[PDB]
Amino acid sequence: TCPFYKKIPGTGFTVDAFQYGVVEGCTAYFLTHFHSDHYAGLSKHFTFPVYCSEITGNLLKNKLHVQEQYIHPLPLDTECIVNGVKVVLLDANHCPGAVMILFYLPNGTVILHTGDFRADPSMERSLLADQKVHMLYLDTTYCSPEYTFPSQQEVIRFAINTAFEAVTLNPHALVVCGTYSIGKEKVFLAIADVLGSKVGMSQEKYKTLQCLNIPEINSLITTDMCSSLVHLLPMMQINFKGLQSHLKKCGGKYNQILAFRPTGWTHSNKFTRIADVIPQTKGNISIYGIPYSEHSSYLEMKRFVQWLKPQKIIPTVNVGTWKSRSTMEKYFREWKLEAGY
Numbered sequence: 001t002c003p004f005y006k007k008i009p010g011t012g013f014t015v016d017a018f019q020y021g022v023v024e025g026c027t028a029y030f031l032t033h034f035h036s037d038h039y040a041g042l043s044k045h046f047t048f049p050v051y052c053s054e055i056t057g058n059l060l061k062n063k064l065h066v067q068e069q070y071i072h073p074l075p076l077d078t079e080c081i082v083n084g085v086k087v088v089l090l091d092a093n094h095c096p097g098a099v100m101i102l103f104y105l106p107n108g109t110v111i112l113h114t115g116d117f118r119a120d121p122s123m124e125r126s127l128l129a130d131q132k133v134h135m136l137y138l139d140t141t142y143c144s145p146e147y148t149f150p151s152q153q154e155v156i157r158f159a160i161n162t163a164f165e166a167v168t169l170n171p172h173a174l175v176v177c178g179t180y181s182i183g184k185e186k187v188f189l190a191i192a193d194v195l196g197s198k199v200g201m202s203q204e205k206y207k208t209l210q211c212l213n214i215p216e217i218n219s220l221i222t223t224d225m226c227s228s229l230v231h232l233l234p235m236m237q238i239n240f241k242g243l244q245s246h247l248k249k250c251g252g253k254y255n256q257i258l259a260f261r262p263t264g265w266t267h268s269n270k271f272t273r274i275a276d277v278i279p280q281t282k283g284n285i286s287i288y289g290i291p292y293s294e295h296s297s298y299l300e301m302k303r304f305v306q307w308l309k310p311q312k313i314i315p316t317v318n319v320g321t322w323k324s325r326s327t328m329e330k331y332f333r334e335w336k337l338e339a340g341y
C-alpha cells in the first residue's frame with residue numbers, strides 16, 4: 001500500500017512509488033532520480049506512463065529495460081502539461097538526472113517535491129522565485145544540527161592534492177575509488193584529470209556512465225583497466241582484503257594502493273576538519289573516508305526552507321520513528337518562529 005507522503009492530492013500523480021503494485025487512482029508515476037530505494041519495483045514489464053528527466057529516462061531504457069513507449073522525458077526549467085496539470089522539473093543538485101518537481105494544482109495550490117536534494121543558494125533564483133509554494137515535500141535525510149560537512153569543492157581539493165602528492169612521490173602507486181550507485185562522479189573524474197589518466201572500470205559501470213550526458217565522457221573513462229591508473233570498484237571491495245586481492249590482479253605494475261570511500265556524513269565530522277583527515281593504513285594500502293555529500297547539511301536545509309516559507313512541510317526521509325518525526329517538527333517550528341512566517 002502506497003504511503004500518503006508519496007501521493008500528490010488533487011491529481012492522479014505519485015512520486016517514487018513503484019513498489020506497491022497498481023496504485024488505485026494513479027494516472028502518471030513520477031521518478032525523481034535513478035537510485036534504487038526510489039525506482040524499486042520498476043522493470044521491463046511496467047506498463048504505465050513514467051515522467052522523469054532525460055538522463056533518468058536513458059537509465060530506465062538501458063539499465064532496467066523499460067519499454068520506450070512508457071518513458072516520458074521532460075526538459076528542465078520548462079512549463080509542461082501532464083494529464084491537464086502544469087508541472088516544472090528543476091535540478092536537485094543530487095546525482096545526475098535528479099530533479100525537484102513543482103505541481104500547479106487546478107484549485108490554485110502550489111506544491112514542491114524536492115526528491116533527494118542538496119539545497120543551494122542558486123535555487124533562490126530558479127523559477128521558484130516567481131511564486132508562492134503552499135506545501136513542501138522535503139528531503140530531511142540530515143535534519144539535525146550535528147550534521148555538518150564541508151562544501152563539495154573543499155572535499156574535491158583535498159582528494160586532488162592527496163592523490164597528486166602520493167603518485168608524484170611513487171609513480172608505481174594505483175588509485176582506487178569505490179562506487180555503488182550513480183552520483184559523486186566528480187571524485188574519480190577530478191583525480192584522473194590531475195593524474196592524466198582515464199578512469200578504468202567494469203563494462204556494467206561504463207554502460208551506466210554512458211547514459212549520463214557528461215560532456216567529453218569518451219575522453220575520461222575506459223574498460224581497458226591496463227591503460228588506467230585510476231580504477232573504480234564496488235564500495236564493498238574497498239577494504240584491506242579486497243584491495244590486496246585487486247593489487248594481485250594488476251600483474252606487478254603497482255606496489256601501493258591509495259583508495260577513497262566517499263561516504264555521506266560520519267561521526268568523524270564532529271571532531272576533525274577536512275584538512276586534518278587521515279587514512280587507515282595496513283602496509284602498502286591506505287584508505288581515506290571523505291565526506292562528499294549529495295544531501296543538504298542541516299544549515300543548507302534551514303536556509304532553503306526559511307527562504308521558501310512553505311505553509312506546510314511533509315518529510316519524506318526518517319519518517320519511520322516517532323522520535324525522528326517529533327525532532328523534525330520541532331526544528332520546523334523553530335525555523336518558522338525565527339524567520340516570522
Ligand SMILES: CC(CO)(CO)NC(=O)Nc1ccccc1
Pocket residue numbers: 310311312313314315329332333336
Ligand atoms: C502538519 C505537519 C505535521 O505537524 C505535516 O507534516 N507539519 C507541518 O506542516 N508543520 C510545519 C511546521 C512549521 C512550519 C511549517 C510547517
Ligand code: NI
Pocket residue numbers: 033035094116
Ligand atoms: Ni538518492
